[PDB]
Amino acid sequence: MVKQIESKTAFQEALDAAGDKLVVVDFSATWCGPCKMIKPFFHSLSEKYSNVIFLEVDVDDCQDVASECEVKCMPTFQFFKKGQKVGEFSGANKEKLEATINELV
């Protein structure tokens, strides 16, 4: 439902396999309280929006992905369509996460 990415190769393949669908990526870390706080809501959105792909990337598992995607903040949500980054924000803001989706899908 939320699917855990555990390599760059898996990241890239997920973006490919998504086709035209919006992909939402949660970049998180175990030291980030707010990241843990929003995980259930992220999962909720994955169940609500079966037309959107939801991915989790733990920055300490995938330092390369975090670095190549220019992640700076915890959590960061990035948004992709057809392999291209179309949005990003930081912070555990539930309404913003949903309003950004509502804008991009």
Short mmCIF file of N, CA, C and O in Angstrom, two decimals:
data_model
loop_
_atom_site.label_atom_id
_atom_site.label_comp_id
_atom_site.label_asym_id
_atom_site.label_seq_id
_atom_site.Cartn_x
_atom_site.Cartn_y
_atom_site.Cartn_z
N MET A 1 0.85 -1.24 0.00
CA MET A 1 0.00 0.00 0.00
C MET A 1 0.86 1.26 0.00
O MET A 1 0.73 2.08 -0.90
N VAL A 2 1.68 1.43 1.03
CA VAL A 2 2.93 2.16 0.87
C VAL A 2 4.06 1.14 0.74
O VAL A 2 4.19 0.16 1.45
N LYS A 3 4.84 1.42 -0.24
CA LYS A 3 5.83 0.52 -0.65
C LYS A 3 7.19 1.18 -0.35
O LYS A 3 7.37 2.38 -0.65
N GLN A 4 8.15 0.45 0.23
CA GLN A 4 9.40 0.92 0.75
C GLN A 4 10.39 0.70 -0.35
O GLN A 4 10.63 -0.43 -0.79
N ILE A 5 11.03 1.77 -0.73
CA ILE A 5 12.08 1.74 -1.69
C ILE A 5 13.40 1.51 -0.98
O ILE A 5 13.74 2.22 -0.01
N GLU A 6 14.18 0.56 -1.48
CA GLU A 6 15.44 0.17 -0.83
C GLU A 6 16.65 0.12 -1.76
O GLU A 6 17.66 -0.53 -1.47
N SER A 7 16.58 0.82 -2.90
CA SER A 7 17.74 1.12 -3.71
C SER A 7 17.39 2.20 -4.71
O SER A 7 16.22 2.44 -5.03
N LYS A 8 18.42 2.79 -5.28
CA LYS A 8 18.22 3.72 -6.36
C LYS A 8 17.57 3.01 -7.55
O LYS A 8 16.63 3.53 -8.23
N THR A 9 18.06 1.80 -7.83
CA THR A 9 17.49 1.07 -8.93
C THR A 9 15.99 0.86 -8.74
O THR A 9 15.18 1.08 -9.65
N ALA A 10 15.60 0.50 -7.52
CA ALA A 10 14.19 0.35 -7.27
C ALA A 10 13.39 1.68 -7.39
O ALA A 10 12.27 1.69 -7.87
N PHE A 11 14.00 2.77 -6.94
CA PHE A 11 13.40 4.11 -7.10
C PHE A 11 13.13 4.39 -8.56
O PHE A 11 12.01 4.79 -8.94
N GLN A 12 14.17 4.25 -9.36
CA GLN A 12 14.06 4.60 -10.78
C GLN A 12 13.02 3.68 -11.44
O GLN A 12 12.23 4.13 -12.28
N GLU A 13 13.07 2.40 -11.12
CA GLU A 13 12.11 1.50 -11.74
C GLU A 13 10.69 1.83 -11.33
O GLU A 13 9.78 1.69 -12.11
N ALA A 14 10.48 2.27 -10.08
CA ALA A 14 9.15 2.65 -9.68
C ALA A 14 8.65 3.83 -10.45
O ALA A 14 7.48 3.86 -10.83
N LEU A 15 9.50 4.84 -10.68
CA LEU A 15 9.08 5.98 -11.41
C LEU A 15 8.74 5.57 -12.87
O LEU A 15 7.85 6.18 -13.50
N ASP A 16 9.49 4.63 -13.42
CA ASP A 16 9.21 4.15 -14.78
C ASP A 16 7.86 3.41 -14.82
O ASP A 16 7.00 3.62 -15.69
N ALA A 17 7.72 2.47 -13.94
CA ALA A 17 6.54 1.61 -13.90
C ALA A 17 5.27 2.35 -13.60
O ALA A 17 4.18 1.90 -13.94
N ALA A 18 5.36 3.55 -12.98
CA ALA A 18 4.20 4.37 -12.74
C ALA A 18 3.51 4.88 -14.00
O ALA A 18 2.38 5.33 -13.94
N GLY A 19 4.17 4.89 -15.15
CA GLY A 19 3.53 5.41 -16.34
C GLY A 19 3.17 6.87 -16.15
O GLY A 19 4.02 7.67 -15.79
N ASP A 20 1.91 7.19 -16.39
CA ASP A 20 1.37 8.53 -16.29
C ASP A 20 0.90 8.91 -14.87
O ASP A 20 0.46 10.03 -14.65
N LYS A 21 0.91 7.95 -13.96
CA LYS A 21 0.34 8.19 -12.63
C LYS A 21 1.20 9.10 -11.78
O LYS A 21 2.41 9.08 -11.83
N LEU A 22 0.56 9.88 -10.93
CA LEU A 22 1.29 10.66 -9.95
C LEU A 22 1.97 9.72 -9.00
O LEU A 22 1.35 8.77 -8.49
N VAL A 23 3.23 10.05 -8.67
CA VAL A 23 4.00 9.33 -7.65
C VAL A 23 4.29 10.35 -6.53
O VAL A 23 4.82 11.41 -6.81
N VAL A 24 3.99 9.95 -5.30
CA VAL A 24 4.26 10.73 -4.11
C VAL A 24 5.28 9.96 -3.29
O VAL A 24 5.06 8.82 -2.97
N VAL A 25 6.38 10.62 -2.98
CA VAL A 25 7.47 10.04 -2.24
C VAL A 25 7.62 10.74 -0.91
O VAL A 25 7.80 11.97 -0.87
N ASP A 26 7.58 9.98 0.15
CA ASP A 26 7.88 10.45 1.50
C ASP A 26 9.31 10.08 1.81
O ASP A 26 9.63 8.90 1.99
N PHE A 27 10.16 11.07 1.94
CA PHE A 27 11.55 10.94 2.42
C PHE A 27 11.55 11.19 3.90
O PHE A 27 11.20 12.28 4.36
N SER A 28 11.93 10.18 4.65
CA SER A 28 11.86 10.19 6.10
C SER A 28 13.14 9.62 6.71
O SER A 28 13.98 9.03 6.04
N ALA A 29 13.22 9.81 8.03
CA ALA A 29 14.38 9.44 8.89
C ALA A 29 13.83 9.04 10.25
O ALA A 29 12.84 9.57 10.72
N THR A 30 14.54 8.13 10.87
CA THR A 30 14.10 7.55 12.16
C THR A 30 14.23 8.55 13.29
O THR A 30 13.63 8.33 14.32
N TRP A 31 15.01 9.62 13.10
CA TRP A 31 15.23 10.62 14.16
C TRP A 31 14.22 11.74 14.10
O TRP A 31 14.21 12.62 14.94
N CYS A 32 13.36 11.69 13.09
CA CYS A 32 12.40 12.74 12.82
C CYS A 32 11.05 12.34 13.42
O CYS A 32 10.34 11.45 12.91
N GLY A 33 10.73 12.98 14.54
CA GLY A 33 9.45 12.77 15.18
C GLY A 33 8.29 13.00 14.23
O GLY A 33 7.40 12.16 14.10
N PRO A 34 8.29 14.17 13.61
CA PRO A 34 7.22 14.49 12.69
C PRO A 34 7.05 13.49 11.55
O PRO A 34 5.92 13.23 11.12
N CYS A 35 8.15 12.89 11.13
CA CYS A 35 8.06 11.86 10.09
C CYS A 35 7.22 10.69 10.56
O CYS A 35 6.37 10.22 9.88
N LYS A 36 7.48 10.25 11.79
CA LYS A 36 6.69 9.18 12.39
C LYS A 36 5.22 9.56 12.62
O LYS A 36 4.30 8.78 12.38
N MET A 37 5.02 10.79 13.01
CA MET A 37 3.68 11.31 13.30
C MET A 37 2.78 11.23 12.03
O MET A 37 1.59 10.93 12.14
N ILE A 38 3.35 11.49 10.84
CA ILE A 38 2.57 11.57 9.63
C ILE A 38 2.52 10.27 8.86
O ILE A 38 1.75 10.18 7.93
N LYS A 39 3.23 9.24 9.31
CA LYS A 39 3.23 7.97 8.58
C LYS A 39 1.83 7.36 8.43
O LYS A 39 1.45 6.92 7.35
N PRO A 40 1.04 7.29 9.54
CA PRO A 40 -0.30 6.75 9.40
C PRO A 40 -1.14 7.53 8.39
O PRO A 40 -1.84 6.94 7.59
N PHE A 41 -1.06 8.87 8.39
CA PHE A 41 -1.81 9.64 7.45
C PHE A 41 -1.31 9.41 6.01
O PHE A 41 -2.12 9.28 5.10
N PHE A 42 0.02 9.25 5.82
CA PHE A 42 0.53 8.93 4.50
C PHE A 42 -0.06 7.61 4.02
O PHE A 42 -0.49 7.47 2.91
N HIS A 43 -0.07 6.63 4.93
CA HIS A 43 -0.66 5.34 4.59
C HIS A 43 -2.15 5.50 4.26
O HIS A 43 -2.65 4.90 3.30
N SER A 44 -2.84 6.32 5.03
CA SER A 44 -4.27 6.61 4.78
C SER A 44 -4.50 7.15 3.37
O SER A 44 -5.42 6.75 2.67
N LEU A 45 -3.63 8.04 2.90
CA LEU A 45 -3.77 8.57 1.61
C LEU A 45 -3.52 7.54 0.54
O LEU A 45 -4.24 7.56 -0.46
N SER A 46 -2.65 6.57 0.79
CA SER A 46 -2.39 5.49 -0.14
C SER A 46 -3.62 4.58 -0.30
O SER A 46 -3.84 4.03 -1.40
N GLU A 47 -4.41 4.45 0.76
CA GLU A 47 -5.62 3.64 0.72
C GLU A 47 -6.76 4.42 0.08
O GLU A 47 -7.61 3.82 -0.61
N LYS A 48 -6.81 5.71 0.28
CA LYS A 48 -7.84 6.58 -0.27
C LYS A 48 -7.67 6.84 -1.76
O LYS A 48 -8.63 6.79 -2.56
N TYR A 49 -6.40 7.08 -2.15
CA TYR A 49 -6.07 7.40 -3.52
C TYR A 49 -5.43 6.22 -4.24
O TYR A 49 -4.25 6.24 -4.43
N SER A 50 -6.22 5.22 -4.70
CA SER A 50 -5.64 4.03 -5.36
C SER A 50 -5.12 4.31 -6.77
O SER A 50 -4.43 3.50 -7.32
N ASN A 51 -5.49 5.48 -7.29
CA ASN A 51 -5.01 6.09 -8.51
C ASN A 51 -3.66 6.85 -8.44
O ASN A 51 -3.25 7.44 -9.42
N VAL A 52 -3.02 6.87 -7.27
CA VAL A 52 -1.73 7.54 -7.02
C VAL A 52 -0.83 6.46 -6.42
O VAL A 52 -1.28 5.60 -5.68
N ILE A 53 0.48 6.53 -6.73
CA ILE A 53 1.47 5.65 -6.17
C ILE A 53 2.14 6.38 -5.04
O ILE A 53 2.61 7.52 -5.24
N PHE A 54 2.27 5.68 -3.93
CA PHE A 54 2.89 6.21 -2.74
C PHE A 54 4.11 5.38 -2.40
O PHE A 54 4.02 4.17 -2.25
N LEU A 55 5.22 6.06 -2.25
CA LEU A 55 6.51 5.43 -1.94
C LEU A 55 7.10 6.01 -0.68
O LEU A 55 6.93 7.24 -0.44
N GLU A 56 7.82 5.20 0.11
CA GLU A 56 8.62 5.69 1.23
C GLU A 56 10.07 5.39 0.95
O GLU A 56 10.46 4.28 0.61
N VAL A 57 10.87 6.42 1.21
CA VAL A 57 12.32 6.32 1.15
C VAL A 57 12.89 6.78 2.46
O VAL A 57 12.69 7.88 2.86
N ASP A 58 13.58 5.86 3.14
CA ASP A 58 14.30 6.18 4.35
C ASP A 58 15.68 6.68 3.90
O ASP A 58 16.44 5.97 3.22
N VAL A 59 15.99 7.91 4.25
CA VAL A 59 17.20 8.53 3.78
C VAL A 59 18.47 7.85 4.23
O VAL A 59 19.52 7.96 3.57
N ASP A 60 18.39 7.11 5.32
CA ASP A 60 19.58 6.40 5.80
C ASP A 60 19.74 5.05 5.06
O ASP A 60 20.83 4.52 5.07
N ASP A 61 18.71 4.51 4.44
CA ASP A 61 18.82 3.34 3.56
C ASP A 61 19.27 3.73 2.17
O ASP A 61 19.91 2.94 1.47
N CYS A 62 18.87 4.92 1.74
CA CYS A 62 19.03 5.33 0.37
C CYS A 62 19.61 6.74 0.32
O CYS A 62 19.01 7.67 -0.20
N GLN A 63 20.81 6.87 0.82
CA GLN A 63 21.47 8.16 0.83
C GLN A 63 21.69 8.71 -0.54
O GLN A 63 21.65 9.92 -0.76
N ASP A 64 21.97 7.81 -1.49
CA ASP A 64 22.13 8.19 -2.85
C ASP A 64 20.85 8.80 -3.45
O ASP A 64 20.93 9.81 -4.13
N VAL A 65 19.69 8.18 -3.23
CA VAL A 65 18.44 8.73 -3.72
C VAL A 65 18.20 10.11 -3.07
O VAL A 65 17.80 11.05 -3.75
N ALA A 66 18.38 10.21 -1.77
CA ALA A 66 18.12 11.46 -1.08
C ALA A 66 19.02 12.54 -1.65
O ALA A 66 18.58 13.67 -1.90
N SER A 67 20.30 12.22 -1.87
CA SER A 67 21.25 13.19 -2.40
C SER A 67 20.90 13.59 -3.85
O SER A 67 20.83 14.76 -4.19
N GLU A 68 20.60 12.62 -4.71
CA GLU A 68 20.33 12.90 -6.11
C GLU A 68 19.01 13.66 -6.26
O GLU A 68 18.83 14.42 -7.19
N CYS A 69 18.06 13.44 -5.34
CA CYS A 69 16.78 14.13 -5.35
C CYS A 69 16.83 15.45 -4.58
O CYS A 69 15.80 16.11 -4.44
N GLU A 70 18.00 15.84 -4.07
CA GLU A 70 18.20 17.13 -3.45
C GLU A 70 17.36 17.32 -2.22
O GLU A 70 16.84 18.40 -1.94
N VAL A 71 17.20 16.28 -1.45
CA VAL A 71 16.47 16.34 -0.21
C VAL A 71 17.33 17.07 0.83
O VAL A 71 18.53 16.80 1.00
N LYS A 72 16.70 17.94 1.60
CA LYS A 72 17.36 18.86 2.54
C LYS A 72 16.70 18.85 3.92
O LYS A 72 17.22 19.37 4.90
N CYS A 73 15.45 18.41 3.95
CA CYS A 73 14.60 18.56 5.10
C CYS A 73 13.93 17.24 5.42
O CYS A 73 13.65 16.44 4.52
N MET A 74 13.52 17.07 6.67
CA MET A 74 12.85 15.86 7.10
C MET A 74 11.51 16.26 7.76
O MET A 74 11.53 17.11 8.66
N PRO A 75 10.35 15.67 7.33
CA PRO A 75 10.20 14.90 6.11
C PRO A 75 10.22 15.82 4.90
O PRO A 75 10.00 17.02 5.01
N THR A 76 10.47 15.23 3.76
CA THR A 76 10.22 15.90 2.48
C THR A 76 9.28 15.02 1.67
O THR A 76 9.47 13.80 1.61
N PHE A 77 8.31 15.66 1.02
CA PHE A 77 7.45 15.03 0.09
C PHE A 77 7.79 15.53 -1.28
O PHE A 77 7.81 16.75 -1.52
N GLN A 78 8.09 14.61 -2.19
CA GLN A 78 8.32 14.94 -3.59
C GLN A 78 7.30 14.27 -4.46
O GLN A 78 6.79 13.19 -4.13
N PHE A 79 7.02 14.90 -5.58
CA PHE A 79 5.94 14.51 -6.46
C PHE A 79 6.50 14.37 -7.87
O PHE A 79 7.18 15.28 -8.33
N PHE A 80 6.15 13.27 -8.54
CA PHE A 80 6.67 12.98 -9.87
C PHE A 80 5.56 12.59 -10.82
O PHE A 80 4.62 11.93 -10.47
N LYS A 81 5.77 12.97 -12.07
CA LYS A 81 4.96 12.51 -13.17
C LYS A 81 5.88 12.21 -14.35
O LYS A 81 6.71 13.05 -14.72
N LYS A 82 5.76 11.00 -14.87
CA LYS A 82 6.56 10.56 -16.03
C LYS A 82 8.05 10.78 -15.74
O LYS A 82 8.83 11.25 -16.58
N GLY A 83 8.47 10.43 -14.52
CA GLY A 83 9.88 10.46 -14.13
C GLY A 83 10.44 11.84 -13.82
O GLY A 83 11.62 11.98 -13.53
N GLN A 84 9.60 12.87 -13.86
CA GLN A 84 10.02 14.24 -13.63
C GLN A 84 9.42 14.79 -12.36
O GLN A 84 8.22 14.61 -12.07
N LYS A 85 10.27 15.49 -11.63
CA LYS A 85 9.83 16.10 -10.36
C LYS A 85 8.97 17.33 -10.64
O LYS A 85 9.42 18.32 -11.23
N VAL A 86 7.73 17.29 -10.18
CA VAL A 86 6.75 18.32 -10.39
C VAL A 86 6.34 19.04 -9.10
O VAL A 86 5.56 19.99 -9.17
N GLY A 87 6.85 18.66 -7.94
CA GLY A 87 6.56 19.40 -6.74
C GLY A 87 7.38 18.85 -5.61
O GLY A 87 7.83 17.68 -5.64
N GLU A 88 7.55 19.68 -4.59
CA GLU A 88 8.25 19.27 -3.39
C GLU A 88 7.86 20.19 -2.23
O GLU A 88 7.70 21.40 -2.47
N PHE A 89 7.79 19.70 -1.03
CA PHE A 89 7.75 20.54 0.15
C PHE A 89 8.29 19.74 1.31
O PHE A 89 8.37 18.50 1.32
N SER A 90 8.61 20.47 2.36
CA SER A 90 9.04 19.89 3.61
C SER A 90 8.05 20.10 4.72
O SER A 90 7.29 21.04 4.70
N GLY A 91 8.16 19.24 5.70
CA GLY A 91 7.34 19.33 6.88
C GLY A 91 6.15 18.39 6.87
O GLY A 91 5.60 18.02 5.84
N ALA A 92 5.73 18.03 8.06
CA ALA A 92 4.65 17.09 8.27
C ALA A 92 3.30 17.75 8.28
O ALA A 92 2.55 17.69 9.23
N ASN A 93 2.93 18.33 7.16
CA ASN A 93 1.73 19.13 7.01
C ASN A 93 0.69 18.33 6.23
O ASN A 93 0.79 18.17 5.01
N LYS A 94 -0.28 17.78 6.95
CA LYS A 94 -1.26 16.87 6.36
C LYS A 94 -2.12 17.55 5.29
O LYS A 94 -2.36 17.02 4.25
N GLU A 95 -2.66 18.70 5.64
CA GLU A 95 -3.49 19.43 4.69
C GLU A 95 -2.72 19.79 3.41
O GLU A 95 -3.23 19.66 2.33
N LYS A 96 -1.52 20.26 3.59
CA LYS A 96 -0.66 20.61 2.43
C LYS A 96 -0.40 19.38 1.57
O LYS A 96 -0.47 19.45 0.34
N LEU A 97 -0.17 18.25 2.21
CA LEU A 97 0.11 17.01 1.48
C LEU A 97 -1.10 16.64 0.64
O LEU A 97 -0.98 16.43 -0.59
N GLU A 98 -2.28 16.83 1.21
CA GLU A 98 -3.44 16.51 0.43
C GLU A 98 -3.76 17.59 -0.62
O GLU A 98 -4.15 17.26 -1.74
N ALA A 99 -3.53 18.85 -0.28
CA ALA A 99 -3.83 19.92 -1.22
C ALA A 99 -2.90 19.92 -2.43
O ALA A 99 -3.30 20.34 -3.53
N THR A 100 -1.64 19.49 -2.21
CA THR A 100 -0.67 19.37 -3.28
C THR A 100 -1.08 18.24 -4.21
O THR A 100 -1.04 18.39 -5.40
N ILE A 101 -1.44 17.10 -3.65
CA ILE A 101 -1.97 15.99 -4.44
C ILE A 101 -3.13 16.50 -5.27
O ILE A 101 -3.25 16.20 -6.47
N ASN A 102 -4.03 17.26 -4.64
CA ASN A 102 -5.26 17.66 -5.31
C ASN A 102 -4.99 18.55 -6.44
O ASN A 102 -5.75 18.70 -7.36
N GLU A 103 -3.83 19.10 -6.39
CA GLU A 103 -3.39 19.99 -7.44
C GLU A 103 -2.76 19.22 -8.63
O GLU A 103 -2.98 19.57 -9.80
N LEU A 104 -2.07 18.11 -8.36
CA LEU A 104 -1.20 17.44 -9.34
C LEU A 104 -1.81 16.21 -10.00
O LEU A 104 -1.37 15.84 -11.06
N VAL A 105 -2.75 15.50 -9.38
CA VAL A 105 -3.22 14.25 -9.98
C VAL A 105 -4.08 14.54 -11.23
O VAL A 105 -4.75 15.58 -11.37
#
